[PDB]
Design a protein around this nucleic acid. Structure first.
Lengths: 282, 281, 281, 282
DNA sequence: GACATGATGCC
DNA sequence: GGCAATCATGTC
DNA sequence: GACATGATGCC
DNA sequence: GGCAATCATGTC
């Protein structure tokens, strides 16, 4: 197995926990010491297994035979999923005490922007647990099973979802408009209109993303955070974030979030995970 | 040292030579035993050195310390540049005798789609050695230099070239339309409108690229070929290709090339690098 | 010379009074018993005179020699300006008490939609008198002088006004944005984007108009009302209308007006010209 | 019973014949001495009868009681249809030879631009007789009957055609694409996007029309000629005209026609109605 | 949450 | 009045 | 080579 | 006829 480095501290229990909550049945498998899932890179497929080694601050990655031809890209995808690039000394020195409770926190990324786009859309309105359920049905109906690993299914490709019947997706438990949004996103992915990597001007791209049918500011923001691992974006419209800033309007929440620039993505995560956090008694 | 695998055969001499001719001073250094170049991933910057290991069918990649944080992405970038994914047994089994003489040929990719887009535009009409001298002046003028490696320079970012003065670009040795093409291409990249990875519908994606100012079909095809490593595209409008298919129009060339689907991009390279090659009867 | 019919009752004093307050020097002359103005239908130019005949319920129209070739269209233009089509019993039978005090009220139209669009723009945030003087200055500066009637100038054509210097106009007594709004309007008329006759979907047509620079919801509605003679539009955003509906928001006034469908245009007219009119509490 | 004057000479035999050949059953009635058709100006409807008095060169027009409230507009519609504004001395004195055998030649207009738009499109490819029959079928399916004249039917409104089922129109004997062209044209007229009156820059206007699905250069030119009564437009693409200029390409014909500016629409009619005509080779 | 409709200041 | 900026309201 | 114009075959 | 594809041409 391939091995990738990381800079301590790294809160692996928090990260794995974060992933377990959103895990999709038949696609991912999350345990306390490892993370494994189906993975498609073009027409190459397999299973990637990520095993952290805390004593050596190394991450071991195993790839099933089908992914070997594109080994390096699988490693890149894993590195983005686990935010291996993070230097906590930098971020913690800037967030100050907002992050002192859990200095090893990282930005959970994704393995594929299109999948993350599909996840963001399905995450609208519903609970984290509910989305994971819905996403599990979309994968079940539209995803390709692996010949070498039978109860692992690959997340649905852009081509398969683009040729799906809106009524069919609606039948899995989502409004018509949401099913439509998924089909439009798949087409954008096919055309290459959906940025699969973080753009130079994130706010302009999110602006373009919002013209898409079914994608408002919450989804564009959340997608930028997870799909691109954009490090400086807040979610002033998030359900939980509004509770964290009781009695505050979306714009207030962001003039406030401004203090955490240019690591607002990290501030966002800490707040979500700080049980009794509340704006300063200033 | 990180290490990556690749299936034999692999003509490193031919690959290195292809990159050597297009090498850009201060950015890349090409020798017959290794390839090295500046590299930027976001704000992480350093120098990468790739050394083929023929004995072991392996490619050894070394990254300076300032690139270590994004090591995996650097490896993916290198694996795409050198086409490590290729299974020559499959390509040649399909191309038959077109590829029988250079079985180890590979598709030279790129390390970043935007950079490759710039190279494609700057490579229009002029010669290979010229494009390389020109692109070097550009990297010289707009590239960020490495503190740890002064002798090197990172390729221009889309943000740097997007706010670039047109005439300033022109004065380097290119029509105004070209400088303008570069500027639009950077803006497009800045807002995620330029696909940085191969899209599901390559044709459609290429048609969209063609609505870009300064980008025609030849450039779109060539961009898809190297920028996305699209394996099934041909360049019927290429100058040399027209010579390989004497008196044949772009459509006749294209209709002929159909016999190599789905590996037309490899067929293209074999024909490009086979002087005196001619079509059948 | 020519004669057109109308259905009684018809308040000519009120109608001529409306046109007199907005009369544009050099273009039109309004008096107690007649209305006259310059008119251009293609390359045919001249003076039209309209004299109401109360005894016969008839309107007499005279055309100078240069307009005879296109006399029918001149007549049509006059019938749209004076709302000759109106059957007051149907309108009053519907508006109920609202129009019982002035049953001969008519919708003052126009004789050219472009010209009317220009007046709508020039009447923004100003007094009737100022708009008139403003329009007149525009008229003398970019119009056509009738050789047969030296004191009459034809209203500015779209071609002439689209090629005007935004600054030469600002200098007449209007903002820079007001002047660009006119120049934009003119290019619209020149290429046929400004509807010259009433569209089937007034709501949609108005929506598009609002995309025009310098044209908001108010100008668009007032334009439909007079330039298209749409009979079921209201002006909630009108300063005067906002005073007639004390402490009500556009949405509230608009919902209150629904009681006058499908004759809201006429209802608007009656409220505009009713001193202490107030909505039912 | 209303009267409009015209300038001699006026070839009524030619005009009535031209209209007679393109007459739409149940909508229009054309005889050797008069023209009559259904007419809708807004919600006002009736029948219009025009009777030409050669003697004292005047056109007598009668309106059904239904159009009386909009009499003036009906008169204007008739004046455009019969090109009564034409000063033949000015045209015949500018085309010389070309227009000498028929100096009473007038430009056949229309009574409504939208109607003329539908005709122009239905007049694509097929013969005059087939177009007339095709149009008659459209009027029968979507047209409005007059309570006072059960024999007459009003030409379909933008409102009905815009709501029409593409398949229903197809079944009348036209390609699906033509049916779709009609539906898009009706939507345009409803929106106010179809110039109902001659625009100042006919060139630009026609170019914009060519962006409409189903409308090409020929339809745009032909629409401008009859629908806006534009006097300076030629039809280098017309079939009959291609035979009048054997061997010449659209551009060559276009270059040639320039000699007749600014009355190219009249030259077009004259060349059309001169079987023996042929150009000069110098 | 997406999205269409609605209700202080500056040029 | 045109117009951007933005909380606020309200089915899907 | 990019890009305006001009000039065969399937709806 | 509309319209997408294709080929030659003259420019920058």
């Amino acid at each position: 197995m391939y091995t990738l480095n990381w800079q301590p501290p790294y809160d692996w229990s928090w990260m794995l926990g974060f992933l377990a909550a959103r895990a999709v049945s038949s696609v991912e498998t999350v345990a306390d010491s490892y993370y494994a899932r189906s993975l498609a890179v073009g027409e190459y497929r397999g299973v990637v297994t990520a095993i952290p080694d805390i004593a050596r601050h190394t991450l071991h990655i195993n790839l099933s035979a089908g992914l070997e031809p594109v080994a390096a890209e699988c490693l890149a995808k894993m590195s983005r999923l686990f935010d291996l690039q993070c230097n906590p000394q930098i971020v913690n020195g800037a967030l100050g005490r907002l992050g002192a409770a859990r200095p090893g926190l990282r930005l959970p990324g994704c393995v594929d922007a299109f999948e993350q786009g599909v996840r963001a859309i399905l995450g609208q309105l519903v609970s984290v647990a509910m989305a994971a359920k819905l996403t599990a049905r979309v994968a079940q109906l539209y995803g390709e099973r692996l010949d070498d690993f039978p109860e692992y299914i690959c997340f649905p490709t852009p081509q398969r979802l683009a040729a799906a019947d809106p009524q069919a997706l609606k039948a899995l438990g989502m409004p018509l408009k949401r099913a439509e949004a998924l089909i439009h996103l798949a087409n954008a992915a096919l055309e290459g209109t959906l940025p699969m990597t973080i753009p130079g001007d994130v706010e302009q791209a999110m602006k373009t993303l919002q013209t898409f049918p079914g994608i408002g500011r919450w989804t564009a923001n959340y997608f930028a955070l997870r799909g691109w691992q954009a490090k400086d974006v807040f979610l002033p419209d998030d359900y939980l974030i509004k509770q964290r800033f009781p009695g505050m309007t979306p714009a207030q929440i962001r003039r406030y979030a401004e203090r955490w620039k240019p690591w607002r993505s990290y501030a966002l995560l800490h707040i979500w995970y700080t049980e009794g956090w509340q704006p300063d008694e200033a």
